[PDB]
Amino acid sequence: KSDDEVLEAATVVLKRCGPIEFTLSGVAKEVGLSRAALIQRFTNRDTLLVRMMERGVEQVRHYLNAIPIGAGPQGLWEFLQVLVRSMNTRNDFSVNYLISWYELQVPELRTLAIQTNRAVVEGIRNRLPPGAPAAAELLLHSVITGATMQWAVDPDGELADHVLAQIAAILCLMFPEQDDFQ
Amino acid sequence: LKSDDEVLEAATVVLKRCGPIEFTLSGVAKEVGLSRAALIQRFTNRDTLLVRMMERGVEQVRHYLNAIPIGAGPQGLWEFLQVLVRSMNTRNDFSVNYLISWYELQVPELRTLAIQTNRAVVEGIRNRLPPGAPAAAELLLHSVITGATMQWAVDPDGELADHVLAQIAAILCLMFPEQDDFQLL
Ligand SMILES: CC[C@H]1OC(=O)[C@H](C)[C@@H](O[C@H]2C[C@@](C)(OC)[C@@H](O)[C@H](C)O2)[C@H](C)[C@@H](O[C@@H]2O[C@H](C)C[C@H](N(C)C)[C@H]2O)[C@](C)(OC)C[C@@H](C)C(=O)[C@H](C)[C@@H](O)[C@]1(C)O
Ligand SMILES: CC[C@H]1OC(=O)[C@H](C)[C@@H](O[C@H]2C[C@@](C)(OC)[C@@H](O)[C@H](C)O2)[C@H](C)[C@@H](O[C@@H]2O[C@H](C)C[C@H](N(C)C)[C@H]2O)[C@](C)(OC)C[C@@H](C)C(=O)[C@H](C)[C@@H](O)[C@]1(C)O
């Protein structure tokens, strides 16, 4: 078992037990090792969460760089569709808001939450066609963020359908010289 | 000595201070100045007190939104949104809002009230849309406020309201091109 593989296993545990009940003992039974082994490789649960979020930042950047780039506003629309539809709601999605809140209470994790968000914002900024409004990347990131929490509180249909309806609405406003976003 | 509404107010202080997980009747008792037994006599237990708190919250949101001065056209919308955004006090227990929200989604009786609460904000925004505003504009505007606020909460720079209203002005400018400029005031 490699350090990377146990970090992925820990991600499973975090999304299942939440950050409060996240423990080395739980990560061990998941990946199939001992607590003493994890304390040797990661010291404590706080450092394991740090290493997990560090890998998360790299994984965000890797995933955003992988999505093909189409032409113009339509390519931006295509990019946002893939990004949003990637959010898995097969299981309880609300645990991720506890993870977020918890991370912001721990300074080193808060820094990594910042880097995670800046990576997504930068990924969107680099896909902006010419002529897009200033700081358009921030407004688009806010729509995804806000519309997702909207649905998380008051779910109606699929998460992606709720979010992308609003993304299409604001893209139509940003790029009125286009036909339409469907 | 201390009315039910006074109890709900003190309980809200405890909730914002301690969060929904460490929230206890003993804490509310200490804050409001009644015995825990008196609170049990009147609210049964901590969970039921939380429900009553969120029921009151739904009415308070609607009354607050209704009371914001009523203006005309896109400018009236812009003015209403400025007041709504500036009402969030980031120096009075703000991060706890996100733990409260998560918690509410775990308790069905509370989640129903969180849904009513968000729907009251969306409808209050809809009630200030001028004729000719895009369909579903209220949901988009609510998402920008909600999303820009969490954006700032994670990665703050400057004041929350300036961060959020910069994006509201930008989207309003796109919603109403005929309009002149959406400036702060
Ligand atoms: C709280 C609310 C926020 O939710 C979260 O933090 C989730 C729980 C993430 O998973 C967390 C947990 C995690 C294990 O992903 C499941 C971790 O990898 C990721 C960094 O953050 C997501 C699902 C990430 O997507 C995932 O990013 C991965 C790099 C690859 C995944 N997929 C294989 C292509 C992809 O779906 C994503 C980048 O958010 C940042 C999605 C992107 C649209 C956003 O930035 C969103 C606006 C989010 O900030 C959010 C909805 O506001
Ligand atoms: C998760 C993040 C979200 O936070 C919450 O939902 C909290 C958990 C709320 O407290 C919940 C729980 C509650 C007990 O308050 C703490 C309850 O009273 C309230 C109705 O909703 C808020 C703080 C409410 O404000 C409160 O509204 C009250 C009418 C008066 C309060 N104060 C005296 C000026 C004021 O702070 C408010 C109406 O949101 C809906 C703020 C309004 C600007 C929004 O809609 C925001 C976009 C929010 O949705 C949010 C930032 O996205």
Can you tell me the distance from the alpha carbon of B48 to that of A29, in angstroms, rounded to the nearest whole number?
37
Pocket of ligand 1, candidates A60, A114, A115: which has the most ligand atoms within 8 Å of its Cβ, to mutate?
A: A60
Can you tell me the distance from the alpha carbon of B12 to that of B6, in angstroms, rounded to the nearest whole number?
10
Resolution attained, angstroms: 2.0
Can you tell me the distance from the alpha carbon of A7 to that of A150, in angstroms, rounded to the nearest whole number?
30
Distance in Å, alpha carbon of B111 to nearest chain A alpha carbon: 7
Smallest-distance ligand from the CA of A61: 1
B100 close to ligand 2 (CB < 6 Angstrom): yes
Token pair listed for A1: 């078992």
Can you tell me the distance from the alpha carbon of B27 to that of B18, in angstroms, rounded to the nearest whole number?
9
Cα-based angle A98, B147, B157 (whole degrees, multiple of 5) = 95
Experimental method: X-ray
Ligand 2 centroid – CA B157 distance (Å): 21
Can you tell me the distance from the alpha carbon of B27 to that of B13, in angstroms, rounded to the nearest whole number?
10
Ligand 2 atom 4: the closest Cα is on which residue? B97
Find the length of chain A: 182
Residue of B nearest to A142 (CA): B147
Task: Determine which of B102, B142, B152, B167 to mutate to test the interface with A (most A C-beta atoms within 10 Å).
Answer: B102
User: Using a CB cutoff of 8 Å and minimum separation of 24, what contacts does B16-19 make?
Assistant: B16/B92, B16/B93, B16/B96, B16/B100, B17/B93, B17/B96, B19/B96, B19/B99, B19/B100, B19/B103
Task: Mark yes or no for CB contact B118/A170 under 8 Å.
Answer: no
**Residue spans per domain, chain A:** 1-182
